[PDB]
Each structure stands twice: as C-alpha cells, then as structure tokens.
C-alpha cells in the first residue's frame, strides 16, 4: 500500500502510505558478567596445554585491566540534547557502593531480575556470562599449586570459547570510550535481547514491533560502560522506546525549479527546502529534515523525535497549496540553474536546464523518454535507469501507483527585475515582502522623479 | 607528474595532473552459500569433544535463525539518488519463485557461472562455501543417533574454521541491516573478487584499473543481503564500474581573501566557494564539491558521479579569469577577517589577517618564511610545517613543481561603502549587479537634495 504524487508546479513529490515507528523515550537495562579477581599465577609448569591456559588467562587479566582504566536540509533549526544522558544518570547510580551489591543479590539464584535502585526506579538487569564460577572452581585450585597438569586439550578449547566473548566486548569498548552504537551480538545476543524485549515493561504492540525488527533497534541503541567492581563487571544498555506507532507517514522529495531562457545568466531559480519525512502525531506533525537519520524496513519508518520539529497539521498544505494563507512554506532562491536529479520512492524527479542531456531508459528497450528543459517526473513502472548528462542514477523498484499532477511552474509568476535571488533561508512571504520592498523602492524613486519641480 | 599553480589575486590554488576513475554505474553480483536444513540434535552424549561440536553447531543453527529473521562547500546543489537501488531491485528478483531453483542448478557442478534471470538480465554468480555438504554428509548422520562419538579432535577444529566465516558475515549484517560498506574480506576474499573482476563484463583497462586498486573498489561497493531459503543463503554485491577513466582531473583549494586595514571590523572579505574536484568528461566537466567522497591512490582519483554535477567546459575560467562573461563564478562575502590556512597537494595557502602570527618552517632549519598580512602561498619543496598562531599544519611531501602567479588581489577593486558583506551564496554577476543596483540609487537621491 504505497502511493506517490508529483506536483509539476513546485518541482517536488510526496510519497504517502507509510507507517510510523518513532522513538519517543528510553529504557535502561544493566548487563553484568561475573568476573573472578585473579592475580598471581603460582604454577610455572612446563607443558603445551598448560602454556595455552596461562597465556589465555593473561588475556583475561589484561582485558580486565583495560576496563578498570575505563571506569573513570533545515537541520540547523533542530534541538541539541545528550542522547546517552539517560544511561549516564543510571551508570552514575551504579557508582553507589550499595547499588552494585543489590545487583549481585538480585541475580544470585536466576540470571535475570528487576532491581529497584536507590533513586527509586525499576530497571531490568541480567547476567550473561559466568567466568568467576568457571575460573575459580576449575582453574584457580590448579594454578595456585606448584606443579599443575592439564589432561585433554579440549579443556583449553572450552576456556577459550567462554573467554572469547569478553575480549571482543573489551575490544569494542576500548576503541569507543565506553559508548558503542549499534549494540553488537557480542554485546547482546538475539536470544538475550529478545528476552529483554519480552520482559520489558511495554505494550504488546511495542513488543511485536521491536521483535520483528531487532536490527533496527540495535542501531538506535547505546551500550554504556558503567563500572567494574567487587567481582562483577557491569555495563548499561540504552534501548529506544517507541511511544508513537502506525501514524500515517509521508516523505517529501524536492528539486530545483528554474526558468529556461536561452541566455544562461538571465535565469532565476527557486527550490522547496522542506524536504524530508512527515508523520502525524496527536493532531500535530513531527518533521524530520534529514532523512538519513531515519531507517525504513518494508513500509515502516523508524525515526527519532530528538531531531524532529513539532509542526501544525497545516504544514501539509505546502504540497497541496503553496500560496495558502495559513502556513508560510519555506524556500530558497538562487540563480544557479544547474542540472540535477532526485529519486523519489516510486520514481524520479528531473531538473534539466541548459543544454545538458537528460534521459531515462529501460533495461530492455533502451531510451524511452527524453526530457524537456525544466522539471519533469517519471514513474518506476517499466523504467529502470535515469541519466542526467554524465551522471547516472538507478530508481527504486518498489511497487505502487504514481500520479502526475500537472501544473504551470510557479517561477513563471516572478518578475526577474525585482526577484530577490540572494535569499537562502526564506519562505513565500519572506520573498514577497523582499519584492514588495524592492517594488516600493523604485516606485517612490519614480514618484520623487515624477513630482520634482 | 603532478603540478600546482597558485593565483595571488583569487586566493586559491589548482593542482593538476591527476587521472580519473569516476564511477558512472553499478554492476550487481550474486553470492551463494549452500546451507544444511538441520533439525534438533538427537544425540545427548556426555563427551567434552562432542559438547564442543554441539555448541559450535548451535552457533550455525542460530546464525541461520538470525538471518531467517532478517527477511521480515556547495554540496547542497547536488542531486539525491538511492545508490543501492540497483542491488535492491536485484535482491527483490531473487524472491521470485523459481529464480532460486535455476540458480542452484546452474552452479551445481561448477562455481562461477552466468545466469539469466526471469526479467531477462545476465548477472555473475559464484558459490563460496559448502556447509550443506560437510554437515549433512559428515555430521548429521552421526548426530541423528542416540549415542554419538567424536574421535580425532582435529575434526572439531576444522569445523570451527569452516563455520567461522559464516558467523562473522552474519554479525556484519545484523549491525548494518543488510547494507554494509565497504565490503569486508569476510564478505569476499581478494581471490574471489578478482575472479569476478576478471569475469566481469568490463573493458581490459577497467580490469587493470580495478585490480591494481581493489581496496578502493571495496570502499565504493555495497554488500546487500538478499534472501535465505531452500537450503541456500544468497546476498547480492553491488560493484562500481568506472565508465570514465584517465581524463585529466584537477583539485581546487580555496581560502578567504580580505583587506588589511588596521581597524577591526572595517575589513571586507571575499572567498571563492567552488572548491572541490574537477574532471574532464565528454567535453563537459564533472564537478565534485565534497572531495571527501573521492579517494586518491597515487595519482589516480576515484569519485562517484552520484555526488557530481556535469558542468560545461567553460567553468574552468574562474581560475584564470573570474570576471569572464561566460561563467558566473560562485563566491561568498563576509566581514569575517579571520586567519586560517588551506593545505594544497603541493603546498599551502595562508590567509593571515589582523594581529595573527603566520609562519612556515622546515623540519631541519625551523622558521624559513614569515608571511605578510593578506593571502600568500608557499610550496612544499623544502617546507614541512605551517603555523597560524598556535594552530599548526603539516604539508604533503609529494614532489612536484609549484608556481606563484602574481596579480593584484581582486578584493582591492571593491568599494567598501557598497560591498554586500551579508551575502552567503552569491557570485560575481550577482554581487556586481547588487553593487550596481545599490550604487545607482544614492546617486539620484543625492542630486534631488541639491534643488
């Protein structure tokens, strides 16, 4: 269920039919790994199997020593917040001496439990790997002795497997200063991660969404290194919370619109600047100017309200009436009539100016359409490629019906003698007043010229 | 064979002599892995070596289950296209019924083979790993039984080796949602990639170009996960193919050019904005405003037409005549007379204004030159460092001849009383008309005051 509409007069296209999945909040979870505070190896025996356990044990001791040091278009209008501020407040609560202990207590019998912290919040904590029990119960009594022996090399392999997960986790943290994104399968396996989503205090629809799209959740999640004390290592995992789901979303593609005079220096241009994602939200509209920060899986849209603006529903009028009196549609002007192209969701927009060659072709029959000078559109049905001069683009092959909304390019209504071609962050009214300011300028000068003597 | 010219009057420098390797299009390639439809381990033996096979085997079973879940300055003028649209459309064709089966057949006996798809296009395919054959023929009959035995432990290690490649490929996709770039050695070894490049439908020159710089091809490639069914795993690899090669490329460095009055805020500035990469292309010029999207290997230049503009050949006049009548050269204006520096390929440009200390030094003899206020230049021959106050830069030590082309700085020709110092995306004619338009009104207005 995907649609798309192109407005010939505004050189822009709107794709409708998408569904929402906006990150509203955060849940913090504590991940623990039971470590064994091991120091002097007493044994100095000579044996190949022994050597492997020793040098593997030094990798463990070195890894903990590393982590011990670790403990101590219109985007310019968006806000600035600390995304990992939630994890920070949590990991700081872990620095409390009693807080670490309450964790070990809660996870004595089972591997997963909810813990109420000293601040008074309930967070889900879980132990994922137990090296303390393996090392101290199977290795420390051997190594503490003068002459030690290892029978069967499989003992060495079993140790490397259990210890390997720690080194890759340590490796990830040592190059990212304790803040990793996305969250790796080393950091949290899917079997572990789904146990969180299933046990998270969220609604069933939220559960079903996260579970079918875990790889997206990973990218919008942070793994915060917290502390490592007593005989446990802990790090906090910051997970996104989607408070808004399934509201109708739509994407805005824009492209420059210019005149087509033969003399190059005489042309004037205008381009709609509000391209990006729009999603309904409580009668308002959350807007995302940088579509790169949003991920799409199937027909669902995952964005972050962090880089959003809350707009009135009337912003939708800019596509269906750019000269409406209720919302001033933002635009910019220039005299740079250069050929470029924009790929839409079900097709492509083409801005063809000057003598640049602009064509679209089929994989089987070759060129099917050659564009005129100006801004045109074509649907993905039966079209596969698009060429603007030497630049070549491919088009998305997502199915859906597209509709061409014909209309005279709006730039034809502006007198270039008074056109403010130097406005970069403007809008409809901002342009008209700049013209009205320039129109009054010559007019009074004419009136003063008219009433002399 | 690299050169460089500095223009004293426009406060900019051009580096010439490079060669082109611009990606005009894409080639899609299909990678297959024969997997084994495995069910629950029947054996529950109490052997340490067997236990290792069990837990290693579960890494395989979960990895497949993981992927089984997976299938459910002036840059603002550039175009906007979906680069991976080509690979995406292909992976969708794989979802078509019957397409998967004809693949498994075509490369049953051999590995690399050409397959014609349902739509009618020929794509290059290759088999990279057979776990189905090893697991089902050597392990599955054992595990299917109650009591199972593992004798030589070397058997376990060989399984760890074969299975490790699968686990790392699965991990890469789970953190990139099936779209990874560059293409890792896990995704495709160099031996495998050259078998593709040699068998690719490209020109001999393209073959030699890609082969001597494969690591760049990796960076301009995408690995798209496609499908996984019928005891087969497949994912498409999008490869850049360079339709334009060896045309003369040149890189433009720009820096601000200002006046040199003592009084602060009384200075006016002008900066050339069209910095980036330029390459000849079919009598036109492909321009890349974001030089970061371009990679340089030796004297070769690798860019993407996706982030290019196709400009006429006359655009080049901006370096040797910014006041030509055929191309309006883009610039920006400000009253921001701040000191800064730009490192070129064969030297460095220095913008020194106000009371700022600006010097360049040699690694052996220390300070060699002290700059005057304004826009100056120095070549890298015998010079290694550049200092702007306390800020320090190093210079590229690639050899080549640099030329200082003297000429009076163009900013000196502008009347500061009428200079539009508040324009950010302008050009010569756009400012010249703005000056001429703003200059004319006071002239008539003043005469009115006389009588």
């Amino acid at each position, epitope marked *: 269920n995907i649609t798309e509409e192109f407005y010939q007069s505004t050189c822009s296209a709107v794709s409708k039919g998408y569904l929402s999945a906006l990150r509203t909040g955060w849940y913090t979870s504590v991940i623990t790994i039971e470590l064994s505070n091991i120091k002097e190896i007493k044994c100095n025996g000579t044996d190949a199997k022994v050597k492997l356990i020793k040098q593997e044990l030094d990798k463990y001791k070195n890894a903990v020593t590393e982590l011990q040091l670790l403990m101590q278009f219109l985007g310019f209008l968006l806000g600035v917040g600390s995304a990992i501020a939630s994890g920070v407040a949590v990991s700081k609560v872990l620095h409390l001496e009693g807080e670490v202990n309450k964790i070990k207590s809660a996870l004595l019998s089972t591997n997963k439990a909810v813990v109420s912290l000293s601040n008074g919040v309930s967070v889900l904590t879980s132990k994922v790997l137990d090296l303390k029990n393996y090392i101290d119960k199977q290795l420390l009594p051997i190594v503490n002795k003068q002459s030690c022996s290892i029978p069967n090399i499989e003992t060495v392999i079993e140790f490397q497997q259990k210890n390997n997960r720690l080194l890759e986790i340590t490796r990830e943290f040592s190059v990212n200063a304790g803040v990793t994104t996305p969250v790796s399968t080393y950091m949290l396996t899917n079997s572990e991660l789904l146990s969180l989503i299933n046990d998270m205090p969220i609604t069933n629809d939220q559960k079903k969404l996260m579970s079918n799209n875990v790889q997206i959740v990973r990218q919008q999640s942070y793994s915060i290194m917290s502390i490592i004390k007593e005989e446990v290592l802990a790090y906090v995992v910051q997970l996104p919370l989607y408070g808004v789901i399934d509201t109708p979303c739509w994407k805005l593609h824009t492209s420059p619109l210019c005149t087509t005079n033969t003399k190059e220096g005489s042309n004037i241009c205008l381009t709609r600047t509000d391209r990006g994602w729009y999603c309904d939200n409580a009668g308002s509209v959350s807007f995302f100017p940088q579509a790169e920060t949003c991920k799409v899986q199937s027909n669902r849209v995952f964005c972050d309200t962090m880089n959003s603006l809350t707009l009135p529903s009337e912003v939708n009028l800019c596509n269906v009436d750019i000269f409406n009196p209720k919302y001033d549609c933002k635009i910019m002007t220039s005299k740079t009539d250069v050929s470029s192209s924009v790929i839409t969701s079900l097709g492509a927009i083409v801005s063809c100016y000057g003598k640049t060659k602009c064509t679209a072709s089929n994989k089987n*029959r*070759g*060129i099917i359409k050659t564009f005129s000078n100006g801004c045109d559109y074509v649907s993905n049905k039966g079209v596969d*490629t698009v*060429s603007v001069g*030497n630049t*070549l683009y491919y088009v998305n092959k997502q199915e859906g019906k597209s509709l061409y909304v014909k209309g005279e390019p709006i730039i034809n209504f502006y007198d270039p003698l008074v056109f403010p071609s130097d406005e970069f962050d403007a809008s409809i009214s901002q342009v008209n007043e700049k013209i009205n300011q320039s129109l009054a300028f010559i007019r009074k000068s004419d009136e003063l010229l008219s009433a002399i003597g | 064979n690299i050169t460089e010219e500095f223009y004293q009057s426009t406060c900019s420098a051009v580096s010439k002599g490079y*060669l082109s390797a611009l990606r*005009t*299009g*894409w*080639y899609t390639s299909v990678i297959t892995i024969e997997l084994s439809n495995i069910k629950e381990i029947k054996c529950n033996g109490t052997d340490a070596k067997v236990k290792l096979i069990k837990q290693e085997l579960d890494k395989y079973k979960n990895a497949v289950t993981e992927l089984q879940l997976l299938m459910q300055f002036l840059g603002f003028l550039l175009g906007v296209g979906s680069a991976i649209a080509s690979g995406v459309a292909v992976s969708k064709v794989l979802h078509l019924e019957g397409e998967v089966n004809k693949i498994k057949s075509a490369l049953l006996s051999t590995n690399k083979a*050409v397959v*014609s798809l349902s739509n*009618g296009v*020929s*794509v*290059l395919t290759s088999k990279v790993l057979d776990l189905k054959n090893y697991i089902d023929k050597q392990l599955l009959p054992i595990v299917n039984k109650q009591s199972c035995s593992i004798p030589n432990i070397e058997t376990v290690i060989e399984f760890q080796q074969k299975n490790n490649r699968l686990l790392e490929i699965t991990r890469e996709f789970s953190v990139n949602a099936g779209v990874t770039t560059p293409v890792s050695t896990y995704m495709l070894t160099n031996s495998e990639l050259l078998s593709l490049i040699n*068998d690719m*439908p*490209i*020109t*001999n*020159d*393209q*073959k*030699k*170009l890609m082969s001597n710089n494969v690591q760049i091809v990796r960076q301009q490639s995408y690995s798209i996960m496609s499908i996984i069914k019928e005891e087969v795993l497949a994912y498409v690899v999008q490869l850049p*193919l360079y*339709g*334009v*090669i*060896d*045309t*003369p490329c040149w890189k433009l460095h720009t820096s601000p050019l200002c006046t040199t009055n003592t009084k602060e805020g009384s200075n006016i500035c002008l900066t050339r904005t069209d910095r980036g990469w330029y390459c*000849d*292309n*079919a*009598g036109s010029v492909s321009f890349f405003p974001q030089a970061e999207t371009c990679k340089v290997q030796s004297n070769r230049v690798f860019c993407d037409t996706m982030n290019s503009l196709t400009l006429p*050949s006359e655009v080049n006049l901006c370096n040797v005549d910014i006041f030509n009548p055929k191309y309006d050269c883009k610039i920006m204006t400000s009253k921001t007379d701040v000191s800064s520096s730009v490192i070129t390929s064969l030297g460095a440009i220095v913008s020194c204004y106000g009371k700022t200390k600006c010097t360049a030094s040699n690694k052996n003899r220390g300070i060699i030159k002290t700059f005057s206020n304004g826009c100056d230049y120095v070549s890298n021959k015998g010079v290694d460092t550049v200092s702007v106050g306390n800020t320090l830069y190093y210079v590229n030590k690639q050899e080549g001849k640099s030329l200082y082309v003297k000429g009076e700085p163009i900013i000196n020709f502008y009347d500061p009383l009428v200079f539009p110092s508040d324009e950010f995306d302008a050009s010569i004619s756009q400012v010249n008309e703005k000056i001429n338009q703003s200059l004319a009104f006071i002239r008539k207005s003043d005469e009115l005051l006389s009588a």
Partner: antibody, heavy 122, light 112 residues
C-alpha cells in the same frame, strides 16, 4: 564538426615500416580513448590497438602484438601507429576511430575518420 | 570466436529486413552490449545504432535494434535505396587478453 584525418599510408615492401598519423579537431581531445581499426579488401573489420585518454592503458590485438606500436600526443591532437615487420597479409585500409562514452563499459565508436590505404606486397 | 552474420540479405524497397548477429558465451553471453555500423560502399563506416537499441542524432527511425541472450538483431522497416551498404554488428569478447569483435558482415542489396 568532429573531424578525423588519416595520413602516411601508401606502398611499402614486406618487412618495412610505416607510421600512420591521425589528426583530430573540433572537440576536447584529451578526454576520449582512441582506437585503430583496419579492413582488408572484401573482408570484415578488425580492431588493432587501444589507448587510454591519458596514455595510461594500452592493449593490442593478439594478431599484431610486438609488431605495432601505438602512441598519442594529447597536445597535438595526434594519434600515431608505428608498424614494423609489415606483411602482405596486413594489406588493409586503416581507420581512425574514437571510443564513445557508455554507462558501463563495452562502448561504441561514435565517429570515424576517412581511412588511409596501406598496401604491402612484394 | 567471432560474431556471425549472414553475408547476403536482399529485399525490395518498402520491405522489412532483419539481420541476425549470433555471438558466443565469451562475448554477448557474458553481458557485453552490441552496436551496429553502416558502411556505404567505399566510404567510412559511421554509427547507425548504439546501446543495443538507440539511434544517434540524424539516423532515420526506420532502423531499430534488439539484444537478447546470445543473439542480436537489427530491424530496417520500410527499406529505401540509400541503405544499400555493408552493415556490421560489434561487441566485446573476453578471451585472449580481450579484443573488440566485429560481425562477419551483411551486404544489404535493395532489389530495385
């Protein structure tokens, strides 16, 4: 508009040498790849040698490797083909041809010169 | 190997004629594109159709080309006498250090 002018061809004995010259004009020469294609009387067309736009890549047809030497001068708009140990079987009309641009390799020759005749016989 | 064309093709003015260009697995079957060149007798061969199916500027739309599998075809609909000439299809083969391949040639004889 686009022009190509061959020269230098004529009669020479087997084993002799000849340098063919092709002068182009009307466009930006140093941007395109150039090629030589020949044709014996009553026979088909045969590609001889290729040269990149900046001389960086050169290949010869397996029939003539080691005997023919291609060169270009991007400043003179010139293309040269040195031919040594010429044989009577090489007797053909030699055409100067430009390699056009395509989206993805395997390009076409968009413009051709008028050709020069090289006749070798004892 | 080399591309295969029938040497003699005859037709009356206004007839429809097709040219078969049979390749092999080492050229077309590898995916390379096909181009066609028109050679008036004694003249320089000029480009007729490029990119399998595209006519350049100043080529009558009467000419049309197709590519499928390992074969190629050129359609001349409504033949006229100014087309009595030699026609060659051209592609690229990957064997033996690579080399541009040409067809065996088609002399179209307009029965006037």
């Amino acid at each position: 508009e686009v022009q190509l002018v061959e020269s230098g061809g004529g009669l020479v004995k087997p084993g002799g040498s000849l340098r063919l010259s092709c002068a182009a004009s009307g466009f930006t020469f140093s941007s395109y790849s150039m090629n030589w294609v020949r044709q014996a009387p009553g026979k088909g067309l045969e590609w001889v040698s290729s040269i990149s736009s900046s001389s960086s890549y050169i290949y010869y047809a397996d029939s003539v490797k080691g005997r023919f030497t291609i060169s270009r001068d991007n400043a003179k708009n010139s293309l040269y083909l040195q031919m040594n140990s010429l044989r009577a079987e090489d007797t053909a009309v030699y055409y100067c041809a430009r390699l056009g641009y395509c989206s993805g390799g395997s390009c076409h020759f968009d413009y051709w010169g008028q050709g020069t005749l090289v006749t070798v016989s004892s | 190997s080399v591309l295969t064309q029938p040497p003699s093709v005859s037709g009356a003015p206004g007839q429809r004629v097709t040219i078969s260009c049979t390749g092999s697995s080492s050229n077309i079957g590898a995916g390379y594109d096909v181009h066609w060149y028109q050679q008036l007798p004694g003249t320089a061969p000029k480009l007729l159709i490029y990119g399998n199916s595209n006519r350049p500027s100043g080529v009558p739309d009467r000419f049309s080309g197709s590519k499928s599998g390992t074969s190629a075809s050129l359609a001349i609909t409504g033949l006229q006498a100014e087309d009595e000439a030699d026609y060659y299809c051209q592609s690229y083969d990957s064997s033996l250090s690579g080399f541009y391949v040409f067809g065996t040639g088609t002399k179209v004889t307009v029965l006037g």
